[PDB]
Design a protein around this ligand. Structure first.
Ligand SMILES: C[C@]12CC[C@H](OS(=O)(=O)O)CC1=CC[C@@H]1[C@@H]2CC[C@]2(C)C(=O)CC[C@@H]12
Length: 432
């Protein structure tokens, strides 16, 4: 009935801005932490032929000859870089991976930074939920926008990796409160019919945001400038999040009808197990793909933009596909297709870059088709549990990438096989 009792155009807009800058802040470490060509610092090179004698074949990116082989050997003439590394600055002027030597034995620290962020989202989305009964949606949006801004601008002045990772947890903690408050305010200040559409617009804004990261990165190579450009813009959103009025529904349930009466006046003046397995799988493979842009194709800038774009195309195709097929076949088929695409990429040769990029973009699009279909199917307690499982999956997606050291193919094989397995679960244990 509250839909009946019930500024929407303006509100969604005051929200397109945070939604356009959120993907940049989550998927920033694909460009700020990119891995540049690295080699051992050798006395013969930093104090073309000199490269060979100083550094063995693989130029190996982790070890160097103790004594130069003017003979050009045994693995015994190799020593780990005791003196450090010399990173290439041709493509990436500055990356965190170069600042805190996140290479070789530490190559897993980059995927962990991306999972500390994701955990910071889970722990945050949980806490902000508890504090939701006590504090309002608008104050929480405004604070969480400032928290993200302060912490995000602050990371540029972080002296050690621990502090960087810690200040990315705080930024993610804040972003969780932004996701919650934004969605909750928009849903609750619109009638139930327009609830869907509004969500489609928010989803499109996120897709444009992913695309825009590729562009922002193409312009701002320095990691410090990229972090400021993806964090500072939040201070403004915090100041422009004041006009948005507090959720009337919250006020009434809270107990304050007089305050609720004022805002409305102003606006006017203006199965479970199968589901969990699918939601975990989609997001443990999605996040794996979106956090591993460099392993997919060599051009990361094009790839991020294309990923953001293939989401819009997918949304639009989804409808026609659903016009003929069903919410179950589409989901399973799309998931299977995404897994197959991830498997194809690992197999496709490095030389054929266009093919590798095409398969990755097909994978991202297909994950988008499955995540759209799942949402419709999901709604048609449980939602909260699923989201908690989905967030856990997104925190174990960037973590499987830590295993690349041991088995390079482990990451793509796991994303592929898990996706294909969920495809079967959707097909057998989900109705229409
Ligand atoms: C799933 C996706 C789009 C991709 C984003 O991935 S990201 O990490 O690059 O921001 C995350 C993201 C966050 C919110 C999601 C959105 C897709 C559309 C969703 C499911 C709705 O209808 C309501 C909430 C929306």
């Amino acid at each position: 009935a509250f839909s009946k009792l019930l500024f929407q155009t303006l509100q969604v807009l005051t929200f397109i801005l945070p939604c356009l800058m959120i993907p940049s802040q989550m998927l920033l470490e694909n460009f700020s932490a990119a891995i540049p060509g690295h080699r051992c610092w050798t006395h013969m090179l930093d104090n073309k032929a000199l490269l060979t004698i100083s550094i063995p074949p693989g130029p190996h990116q982790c070890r160097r000859f103790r004594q130069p082989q003017w003979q050009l050997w045994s693995e015994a003439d190799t020593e780990p870089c005791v003196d450090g590394w010399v990173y290439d600055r041709s493509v990436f002027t500055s990356t965190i991976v170069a600042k805190w030597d996140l290479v070789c034995s530490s190559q897993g620290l980059k995927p962990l930074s991306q999972s500390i962020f994701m955990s910071g989202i889970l722990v945050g989305s949980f806490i902000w939920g508890l504090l939701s009964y006590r504090f309002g949606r608008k104050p929480m949006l405004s604070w969480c926008c400032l928290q993200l801004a302060v912490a995000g601008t602050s990371t540029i002045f972080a002296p050690t990796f621990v502090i960087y990772c810690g200040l990315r947890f705080v930024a993610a903690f804040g972003m969780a409160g932004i996701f919650l408050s934004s969605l909750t305010l928009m849903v609750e200040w619109t009638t139930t019919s327009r609830r869907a559409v509004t969500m489609t617009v928010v989803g499109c804004a996120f897709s444009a945001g992913q695309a825009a990261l590729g562009g922002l990165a193409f312009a701002l190579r320095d990691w410090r400038t990229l972090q400021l450009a993806a964090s500072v813009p939040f201070f403004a959103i915090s100041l422009i999040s004041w006009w948005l009025p507090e959720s009337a529904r919250w006020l009434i349930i809270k107990g304050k009808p007089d305050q609720a009466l004022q805002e409305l006046r102003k606006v006017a003046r203006i199965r479970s197990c199968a589901m969990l397995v699918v939601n975990f799988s989609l997001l443990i493979s999605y996040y794996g793909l979106v956090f591993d842009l460099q392993s997919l194709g060599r051009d990361i800038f094009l790839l991020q933009a294309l990923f953001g774009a293939v989401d819009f195309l997918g949304r639009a195709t989804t409808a026609l596909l659903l016009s003929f097929l069903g919410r179950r076949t589409i989901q399973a088929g799309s998931q299977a297709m995404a897994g197959l695409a991830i498997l194809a990429n690992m197999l496709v040769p490095q030389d054929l870059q266009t093919l590798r990029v095409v398969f990755a973009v097909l994978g991202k699009g297909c994950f988008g088709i499955s995540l759209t279909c799942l949402t419709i199917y999901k709604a048609e307690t449980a939602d909260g549990i699923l989201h908690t499982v989905g967030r856990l999956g997104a925190m174990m997606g960037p973590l499987i990438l830590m295993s690349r050291q041991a088995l390079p193919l482990l990451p793509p094989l796991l994303y592929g096989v898990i996706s294909i397995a969920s495809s079967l679960v959707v097909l057998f244990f989900l109705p229409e």
